[PDB]
């Protein structure tokens, strides 16, 4: 059998049924909504997952602590289906691509109910992070519900890049500014949660939330399926936002190590990952899979952004552990 720990809403429904059905290997699917939740289980140590999926910065600190056995790439033949230029971008956390295979990647930004926003904000354009980070905008959007992510790794590097500071700064003076920005709009945040906005956007409970690329595209497509006239949209603000990459990695204390390789060779297939991305709303690392994908996903500039959009997006860096504590303190101070 095989045990997996992946994000919420991050796989097509029949991907597993197809896998077991082809290979015979029965799967157990466990889920988490933040990077910290996963990272916490990893130092617990005895978390018995054969396949876990961190983000690009989190992966690098967990390598430097020896959590994931090396990749026996002899058992990953479809490894060459991977974008060569994607891999090299992620040597900054995994040198020489030794431990982690890419899965899905995307951005993060604003997801909003167009009707309920313009109702409370008029024709003001939703294009600046100042929608969420300015009290004069938030004080009114607060009747309609705003949702931040419960993670200092998302909320704080976003507030930094909003003011124009370095989102990967090590400076306590900077986090000071970002802190007292967030703590001036906190009275209007209806909750901090990295996942329960997807459903909460489609059902009209909130009208704006800090969200991920596909999370919102999911939330939108969920909304119209319900067929009640909820227009959910996703807009990467003008100040840019966080670009990231999630990668699958086999822990050291894992035991279905072979089964884990087979499941990862079946997701390097340009056919399957298409079905995954087509459903979840995130771009994958298999270039051969785009010609096979639903166009509205494989053609979207917010799913697959162009360079001009990229050339102003920050990639979270492997921060010194001194600084991570400044994050966690500052973010818990906002609580």
């Amino acid at each position, epitope marked *: 059998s095989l045990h997996i720990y992946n994000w919420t809403d991050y796989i097509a429904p029949t991907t597993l049924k197809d896998f077991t059905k082809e290979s015979g290997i029965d799967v157990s699917y466990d889920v988490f909504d933040s990077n910290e939740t996963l990272e916490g289980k990893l130092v617990s140590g005895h978390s018995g997952y054969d396949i876990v999926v961190p983000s690009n910065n989190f992966l690098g600190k967990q390598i430097q602590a020896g959590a994931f056995q090396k990749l026996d790439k002899s058992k990953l033949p479809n490894w060459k289906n991977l974008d060569p230029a994607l891999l090299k971008q992620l040597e900054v956390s995994d040198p020489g691509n030794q431990y982690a295979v890419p899965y899905l990647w995307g951005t993060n930004g604003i997801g909003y109910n167009v009707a309920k926003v313009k109702e409370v904000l008029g024709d003001q354009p939703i294009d600046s992070w100042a929608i969420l980070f300015e009290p004069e905008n938030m004080k009114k959007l607060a009747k309609c519900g705003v949702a931040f992510m419960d993670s200092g790794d998302e909320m704080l590097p976003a507030a930094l890049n909003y003011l124009g500071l370095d989102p990967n700064t090590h400076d306590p003076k900077d986090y000071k500014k970002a802190e007292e920005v967030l703590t001036k709009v906190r009275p209007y945040v209806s909750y901090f949660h990295s996942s329960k906005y997807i459903s909460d956007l489609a059902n009209g409970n909130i009208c704006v939330a800090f969200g991920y690329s596909g999370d919102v595209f999911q939330a939108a497509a969920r909304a119209e399926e319900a067929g009640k006239g909820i227009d959910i949209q996703y807009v990467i603000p003008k100040e840019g936002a966080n670009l990231w990459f999630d990668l699958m990695a086999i822990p050291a204390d894992a035991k279905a190590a072979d089964n884990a390789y087979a499941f990862i060779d079946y997701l390097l297939r*340009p056919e399957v990952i298409a079905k995954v991305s087509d459903y979840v709303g995130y771009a994958n690392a298999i270039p051969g899979a*785009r*010609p*096979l994908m639903d*166009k*509205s996903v494989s*053609d*979207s*500039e917010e799913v697959y952004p*162009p360079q001009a959009v990229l050339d102003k997006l920050y990639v979270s860096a492997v921060l010194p552990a001194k600084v991570l504590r400044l994050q966690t303190r500052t973010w818990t101070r906002i609580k």
Partner: single-chain antibody
Amino acid sequence: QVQLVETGDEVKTPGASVKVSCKVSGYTFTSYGISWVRQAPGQGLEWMGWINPNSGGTNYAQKFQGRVTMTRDTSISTAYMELSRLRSDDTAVYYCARDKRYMDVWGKGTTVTVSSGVLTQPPSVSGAPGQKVTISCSGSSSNIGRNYVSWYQQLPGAAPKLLLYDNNKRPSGIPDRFSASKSGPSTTLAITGLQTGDEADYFCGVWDSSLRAVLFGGGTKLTVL
């Protein structure tokens, strides 16, 4: 080399039914999609449907679902489109294009003649040799606004060619003069050292994420003096 070869050519009665085969050569057939672009005489390109040759997926333009059917013998690397209430209208050349989001290699087109009984784009521009000229194409948040765009150049009597992809990328061969720009819901092609050989119809093509079709521009005819 990479080519699609299309069917024989076919005269058909107003109640009928036509099948157009399309055989691909010299590329992993199951790797790229396939697209059907119809063109009535004297008018523009029209999206019909897209078939995923790997999984049999069928995206029919809403105008044709209920009358079109798209299939594929993977064994013999071909695709099939069947219209099924041939009308005084459908008289057209039926082109067949390898779809990699855009359509880089086009077939040569099959003609159906049935006899018995969108995107605001300007209709034509006229320019002098040497000068620069522009062609716009205005969509919406559903289309030019959200998704990547493709520009196609149809020289006289020829099947459409790929001029630009990925909002503004040039295929090997398309020279420097041809480049596109993009703001909000508009993409504006602009040819610079306007030669004589550039006399043609130019079409923008995007995917409208709400209608679920590859919306073409009405087309502009370019006459160079």
